[PDB]
Structure formats: structure tokens, C-alpha cells
Amino acid sequence: SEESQAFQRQLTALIGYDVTDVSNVHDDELEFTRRGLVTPRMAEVASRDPKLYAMHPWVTSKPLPEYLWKKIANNCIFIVIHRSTTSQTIKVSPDDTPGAILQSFFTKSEQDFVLRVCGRDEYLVGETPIKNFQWVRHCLKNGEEIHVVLDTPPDPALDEVRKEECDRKFRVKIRGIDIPVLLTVFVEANIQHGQQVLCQRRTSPKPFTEEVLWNVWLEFSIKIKDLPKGALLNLQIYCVQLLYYVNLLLIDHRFLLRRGEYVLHMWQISSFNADKLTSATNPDKENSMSISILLDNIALPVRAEMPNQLRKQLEAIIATDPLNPLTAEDKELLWHFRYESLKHPKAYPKLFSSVKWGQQEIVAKTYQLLARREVWDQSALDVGLTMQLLDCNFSDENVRAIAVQKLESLEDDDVLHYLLQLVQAVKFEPYHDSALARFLLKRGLRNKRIGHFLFWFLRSEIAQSRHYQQRFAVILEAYLRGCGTAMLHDFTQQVQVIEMLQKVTLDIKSLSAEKYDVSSQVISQLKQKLENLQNSQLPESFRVPYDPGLKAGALAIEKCKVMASKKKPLWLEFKCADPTALSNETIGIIFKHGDDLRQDMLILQILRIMESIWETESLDLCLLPYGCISTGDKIGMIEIVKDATTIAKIQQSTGAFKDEVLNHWLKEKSPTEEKFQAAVERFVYSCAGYCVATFVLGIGDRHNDNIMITETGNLFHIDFGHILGERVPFVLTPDFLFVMGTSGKKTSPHFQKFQDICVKAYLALRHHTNLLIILFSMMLMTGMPQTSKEDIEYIRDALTVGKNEEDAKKYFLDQIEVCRDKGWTVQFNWFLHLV
């Protein structure tokens, strides 16, 4: 069909990679996967409700927190409903549905009308009490009135989906290696299963020539039958240093033992990270190192009661943290008493890490154990635990599948919380098709909000990671074929605008080097390029990728500008295309090159999780995880927080610092004394929040230039990629303390409170130690370009694993005192080392 080839062309532009391309593939797993993902696509497409899908209501089954109960008048909530002009405030109890409140309204075609939010693509619809809608909870947190506009439901017609159309020892021959351009070298051959080396053979050393030929059989001690599925033949070249690596799945996607002539182009090194695991080969055929190999070698098809001191010992092991490495003794015990270990869900990661995966007999027994998982099946979903099983330590389908099963019960609100980290977790899958990928796919097709971010998270990786672009593309394509016509058009708009505004960000950066500030003619160039794009190619309105509720429209070219930090990022402002919008405040977007934003995304997604945790223990520390989306290599977009400045500028209104300046800025920006005291309170929460959060994540030691505050006193850290690219545990400088009214070594009402909020928040995180450890662990492995055990075991020390709550109270309070004793020392030292 000529239609499908235009559609397939249409798809490739949205993805930024061609899945039909067969240049860098030596098997058809990628094609097999595309075929495979039709069934679950079409199933989910078929079973999804037209109406609710179109309106995509954002709701939660969670309780309303205490702090939001206290913000309510008298079991009564004021909703303001709008026509084309006039409006009426309605009194409503939190437990009313959108239908019930609609019935109550018309008293003052009833089922032909829906309560849309004013200024947003956000509907308050469906059998959910008004309190359970996220937009309502946002309004209640902020203390803003809840404004809606009655109008027609969106047409499901628009979400139309296009109809689609041997006991033999294993051995490998190393032929040799080959590269055009450039010591002693050898080829190391590893058989791995969940970064666990089963056997290793090293080829004899030879001179480091462009073409090194061996023609040698590396014979292993593992039988062919004993190879487990998802076993990777890891080939690495050495010289005391590792230079190149490549992987080959010894067992393929059809359960067949891999055989035949292979020539694999290798990835160069820039110990462990996600990129090391990829079955993909280097696409750059001209520069890269190749290796030639040959494979010829066949499908893969009443208990006595525990002692006290053993159950003790077992329960000890299971209780410990995920980074706690298991002794051989621990694993033998876990395995021997596996049927008892199966009764404890929190043993599972450890228990499956105790399996000999190089023994068909043991693997088979392992599988008999998973058949009797009534305990797991009935266990309350533990997300942290479920993540552990999807990390790099487990490369077994069945094991990994029980984790994915447990995720099925996640509400859409919770999926979003974890979606980024769950996309990154695909890097740990051994095969392109996997229960995880299908889960992602299914949940995105079910809910347009999840679908939207999924698009951007996959695309983020497709556009830079050569190690994983092929896999993510196939998954993305799969989603795009099911999301519907209204979304397709949305994404096309979005991607065009993004690519447009990237060119400008890059082109403007070419015009002025890091060496000097903004030029007049460069500003003149800027405002012409925008004039040009607005008039020529900018669409009338596009959806904001970091906040898909909001639709941005026409540029405020007057209000646009460019900074001078040598990064030279843009600062764009747009009118909101929605005329029903309550305010005329712009939509502020910052476009920047030269900064890796994948890091920022992950840190922020963790912040959002830390807030969700705190909500469960009746706490809100006014964190501000702004919108941020990596769009390509070193390029992304950032949400501009309105009425916000940096702590640095406040101080400069060389390297001299005054403690009071911060306090005076708040007095200046608050009209009323009450609003000053409200903002001083917001500062104490937000400071404590960011103090705790950054301490746990090992990123507290920032420069003032990297910290900001809103005019309403909401402090919030920024530029997290910068840190991950004489010390203090976190920024709690003398100015921050002067707001609280304490100076030197003293104490006051707000400082005594600050400390109450810190510890409470800190100990709340410790209640989810295991979750944060795994998210943090995973962040390092999938977020950073280059990671080690020493790094990962920081969070262990920062969360003070295996301790009482009072030693932890002590620890953190000591950390406060360290900040005070140092004062300005560290802030000062940046200027000193700069200059």
C-alpha cells in the first residue's frame, strides 16, 4: 500500500530513527518484536473506553492528606463554573462526582456536557469524587480557586486507530579483530547471566596490529545443555586496560542455539553500567573495531522443620539491604531452605541471586518453585522490591515476569511516578520483546497521559543512546500505531516545534562563543529568527511536552532573551492558546544545549517520589520538581518557574556575601507581614525538603548560582546535571539561617521547627530505604555516561542502613551543625578556585 509507506514515513519522523532499516542488525529479533507487539497493542486498543480515553481524567485512589483536609472550609469545596461569559460559585462536598455536581448545577441535555478545567486540556469527569482528582488537589495545595468551563465532550472519532497490515562443551572460535586506524592485546570471552560470569576464556596475547588474527577455539567447561536462556556471550578486548566490548545472545529469540559466521562491530570504552549489557552492535561500521567469530555446536524446551539458629540466620539475611552482598554461605542456605525462603516476598531478589544459573537441573528446580507462588501472588505490591527484580542482576524471563505481574495492579497515578525509571529498566532486559516492554506499551495505550510521557522518554533515548536506540524505537513505533490520530497529530506538532527551536538554540550558540557576553547584532539576529519562524513554520498552537495539559501558542518575542554562562541557553515565552485561560501569564520554556538532561530528569523523578512518600506520612516540604525533558544529545527543555530568581543574584543587589540580603528580598517581595511570615514558613519547609533530598542523593554541596527561590519564598535547587558532570553536606548557608532568625551558634522558633521538619522527613525516607537504594542504584547505571560500587554505597551511609531512629536523629542533626560551623567557606571557595 502507498498509504502505509506514507504512514511509515510519518512514523519515522516522530521517532527520529528508522526501524525498517536493517544496516546494523545481524538477526531478525527487531522485526520479530514488531510482529510480536501487535497482539497486545490491538488488545488494549480494543478494550479501552473511547470516552474516558479521550478525556484522560487524572485521578488517585489515595487518601486526601491531613494538611489538605485542614485547608477545607467546613466539609465544603467551592467550584466556580463558567459559560461563555457569566459564572457561578457552587458549594460542594468533597465526595461528589462530576455527574452529581452536574445534576446539582442544572437545577440552578444534562449528559451532553462535561466540566473541563479553565485554560487546560484537563477534564473533571468519571465516577471519582472531586477530592480524588489531581487538579483539585493541586488547587487545594496552592490555595487557588477551582475554575472549570462547561462545554461539549471531546469526540472519540478523533482517537481513531488505523487498521494495520548436547553434552558437547560450548566453544567459540575467535578468528580475529580488525580496525582501520589506531602494545599487546588479547580477546577475553565471557558467558554472562545477569552480569554474573559463569565461565571465562582468554586468548593468548599478541602485538597490537590493526588486524590481529588468531584462528583459535576458546573451549569452555559449560555444557551446551547447561546454557540458560538470555545468556550473553560477552566479548571484550584488552591490552591492563579494557578498550572495546560487544555482546551476543548465545540463545536467540526463538529458543534456538545461536550458530554461524559473525562479524560484530564493537563499542569502545570512554566498572559496570547499562550500555555494557546491550545486544546491539556499533552502527558506525567505518571507524569501529570489528571482531570475527565462528559458532557451531538444538532448541531449548512433607518437609522437616528448621532449627532456631538457622531460621534466625536466614531471616537475618532476608532483612538486610539490597546492596548487602551475599556470601557463598548465605546462598547455599537460601537455596537449601528455598521453600521457606519462598514464604517471604522480601527474600526473592536474594533467593534468585542464590541460584546457579549455569545448571539446567538447578534452573529447572527454580522454575518448579515459581510454580507454587501463592505467597507472592497474594502479597501487597512492594514497588522497591519489584524494581530489584527488574534490575541488571536478574536476566531470567520467569523471574523478571513475576515482578512485572506485580506492577499490573499499579494505578495510572503510580505508573507515572515510576514510568521513567521503568523505561530505563528496559536496558536491563536481555531480549527486545519482554513482559516489561508490553506492560509499558499497554499502560500508555490505555491512558493518554502515560502515553505522552512514554513517547518523550523513549524518544529521549532513541535520540542519543546508540546502545539502545533500536530497541526503544521498535517499542515506540508499537505505541504510535495504537495511540490514535489525535495524538499522532499532537506529537508531530510538538516534534516540529522542538526541532525548530533546537536549530535556533544551536545556531545562536554558533553566533556567540563562550568567550564574550550577548552581542547587540546577535540579539538582532535572535529576534529576526523568531520573527521568521513564527511567520513561516511555527504552528498556531502546540502542546507543552513537560506539562501536556497546557497548550502554548504565539511567541512573546519581546520577552525572549539569551543568557551569558557560556552555555548560552534561550529563554522563550509563549501566550497560552486557550482563550478560556483565567490568566494571561506566559508559558515560559528554557531551551539549552551543552547540558546532559537525562541526569536532571532522573533526579527530578526521584524528587517526585520523595514527595509521594512524604504525603503517606502527612508531610509536604514544598519541593519544586520543575518540568524537564531531554530531547536529544545534550539538548532539552526546562520549565521556567514564574517569579523566581537565583540565590546568587539576591546576594549581588567580588565574592563578598551578606547574611541578611535574603531576608530583605522576602520582605521586599511580600506586601503584607502575614505573607512574609507565610513565605518564611514556605522557605523553612522547602529548605528542609531540599536539604534532606540532596543529602540522600549525595548532591547537597551546590554553588549559590545553582539554587533558586520564588517570590513566595519557595526555595528550589536546579541544574542537577552540573554536579554529576573542604566540603559541606548541604547548602544551609548563614543567609538561609538568618531568615529563620538564628546567627552563629544560636537557636530560634523557626530553626527549632526546621530541625523538626528535617528529621521527620529524613526518617520517613528511611521507612523506604530499600526503594530509594534501588532507584538510586538504577539511576547511576542508566543515567550517567560513565559507575562503581563505592559510589552506589554512599546512599547506604546517607540513609544509615541498619540503625535505630535516634542515632539517625543524631546523625542528621550533626550534619546541620557542620553547615553552620563552615558558614560561607564553601560558597566563597568557588570564586577562589574559579579566580
Ligand X SMILES: C[C@H](NC(=O)c1c(N)nn2cccnc12)c1cc2cccc(C#Cc3cnn(C)c3)c2c(=O)n1-c1ccccc1
Chain contacts with ligand X (rule: CB under 6 A): 561-563, 569, 571, 590, 626, 638-641, 644-646, 649, 708, 718
Q: Which is nearer to ligand X, 412 or 639 (CB)?
A: 639
Cβ(214)–Cβ(206) below 8 Å: yes
C-alpha cell, 406: 506485580
Quick one: 415 or 707, whose CB is closer to ligand X? 707
Minimum distance of ligand X from residue 615's CB (angstroms): 23
In the complex, minimum distance from the CB of residue 231 to ligand X, in angstroms, rounded to a whole number: 44
Complete edge-to-edge strand list for the sheet that includes strand 644-646: 644-646, 707-710, 715-717
Output 623 or 795, the one with its CB closest to ligand X: 623
Binding residues for ATP: 588-597, 623-631, 716-724
Closest approach of ligand X to the CB of residue 670, in Å:
19
* Positive/negative CA dihedral, 8, 10, 15, 17: positive
Number of CB atoms found within 10 A of residue 414's CB: 17
Kindly report the backbone phi and psi dihedral angles of residue 153, in degrees, each rounded to the nearest multiple of 5, phi listed first: -60, 150
Nearest to ligand X of 393, 714 (CB atom): 714
| Among 227, 289, 297, 230, CA closest to 259 | 297
Q: What is the DSSP string of 618-681?
A: T---------EEEEETTEEEEE--TTEEEHHHHHT------STHHHHHHHHH-SSHHHHHHHHH
Between the alpha carbon of residue 802 and those of residues 76, 177, 321, 761, the distances in Å are 45, 49, 8, 18
Identity of the residue, 628 or 728, whose beta carbon is nearer to ligand X in the bound complex:
628
Cβ distance to ligand X smaller for residue 69 or 571: 571
Q: Which is nearer to ligand X, 668 or 791 (CB)?
A: 668
Minimum CB distance to ligand X, residue 490 (Å): 24
Q: Enumerate residues 6+ apart whose C-beta is below 8 A from 395.
A: 193, 194, 230, 231, 232, 428, 430
Residues in the chain followed by a break, C to N above 2.5 angstroms: 108, 165, 182, 239, 270, 297, 301, 653, 725, 786
**529 SS3 class:** helix
C-beta atoms surrounding 329 within 10 Å: 10
CB of 599 to ligand X, least distance (A): 13
Residue 784 Cβ, how far from ligand X at the closest point, in Å? 20
CA distances from 637 to 570, 590, 598 (A): 10, 6, 11
Which C-beta is closer to ligand X: that of 324 or that of 645?
Answer: 645
User: Which residues, listed in sequence order, are joined to residue 818 by a DSSP beta bridge?
Assistant: none
- Comparing CA positions, the residue from 8, 107, 125 lying closest to residue 59 is 125
The grid cell for 695 is 543529602
Task: Report the alpha-carbon distance of residue 14 to residue 272 in Å, rounded.
Answer: 32
Shortest distance in whole angstroms from residue 566 CB to ligand X:
12
CB of 497 to ligand X, least distance (A): 18
User: Residue 269 is placed in which grid cell?
Assistant: 570504552
If phi over 0 gives left and psi between -120 and 50 gives alpha, with beta otherwise, what is residue 623? beta
CA distance 7 to 160: 14
Report the residue count for the chain.
835
Instruction: Dump strand ranges (E) for 11-168.
Output: 77-82, 87-92, 114-117, 123-124, 146-151
Instruction: Decide whether 140 or 723 has the Cβ nearer to ligand X.
Output: 723
For the residues of 726-745, what is the DSSP string, one character each?
Answer: ---SS---HHHHHHHT--SS
Binding-site residue ranges: 588-597, 623-631, 716-724
Report yes or no: 158 and 486 within 8 Å, Cβ to Cβ. yes
Nearer to ligand X, 498 or 718 (CB): 718
Give the residue ranges of DSSP H helices in 425-484: 435-446, 448-462, 469-483
Minimum CB distance to ligand X, residue 639 (Å): 6
Name residue, grid cell 506529537. Answer: 491
Cβ 686 to ligand X shortest distance, Å? 14
Burial class (CB in 10 A: 0-12, 13-18, 19+), 673: exposed
> Taking the complex as a whole, how short is the minimal distance between the CB of residue 598 and ligand X, in angstroms?
15
Which of 32/657 has CB closer to ligand X?
657
3-state secondary structure of 192: strand
Q: Is 180 helix (H, G, I), strand (E, B) or coil?
A: coil
Least distance (Å) between residue 511 CB and ligand X: 15
Pick the closer one to ligand X by CB: 580 or 646.
Answer: 646
Closest contact distance (angstroms) between CB of 565 and ligand X is 8
CB of 568 to ligand X, least distance (A): 8
Query: Closer to ligand X at the Cβ: 249 or 648?
Result: 648
User: Quick one: CA torsion of 137, 139, 145, 148, rounded to 10 degrees?
Assistant: -80
- Whose Cβ is closer to ligand X: residue 238's or residue 571's? 571
Given a contact cutoff of 8 angstroms between Cβ atoms, the answer to whether 366 and 352 are in contact is yes
